[PDB]
Copies of this chain bind each other. A is one copy, B any other.
């Protein structure tokens, strides 16, 4: 249950930031000595709560969905990925033409979009593409911006390799994406250049 626990640790870490923020915000509201910050506290509760909703709507499909056969609308996927990009620096350029997407496609695309975002820790553009053609659905996310970089744990996860030294959270997501694309019969590919990275997957459709 080592894999499962690492994924749970990931989820907990992402949710804990905005949840702590709400708590803090409300502590400030009640503290008779911080009345100078009432409005910033109230804004922080509102925004954190929105951040949490966005992260939970996303995590339910990206991580929580089952292997079971089910189509999603790509517009709804755009919406989930847009929600997660709202709370980090890079911008999202979603280019999948609206259409229904099978379940591996859908779990795959959401994960790919976020790995692309977290490859851009000083901003940039994550361009998301996805075409149904030739008995497949083929996804590619291009991340572009300063110091764009797939960390080593991400790359080892995307190849299904154990985690060496590097962070569990980035890894578990990448390995999870690898395992689900392999169980589906497809393949992961990566490109790395100067100020750029891209992550690609195909799956049968």
Contacts and interface: CB of A to CB of B under 8 A. Distances in A.
Interface of A: 1-9, 11-12, 15-16, 19-20, 22-23, 26, 45-46, 49-50, 52-53, 56, 59-60, 63-67, 176, 179-180, 183
Contacts of A4: 3-4, 7, 63, 176
B7 A23 contact: no
Contacts of A65: 5, 9
Contact of A183 (B1, B46, B52, B66): B1
Contacts of A63: 4-5, 8-9, 12
A64 B12 contact: yes
User: Chain copies in the assembly?
Assistant: 2
Nearest to A59: B12
A11 B14 CA distance: 12
Residue among A3, A5, A16, A180 with max Cβ neighbours from chain B (10 Å): A5
A106 B66 CA distance: 29
B2 A67 contact: yes
A1 B64 CA distance: 10
Contacts of A20: 53
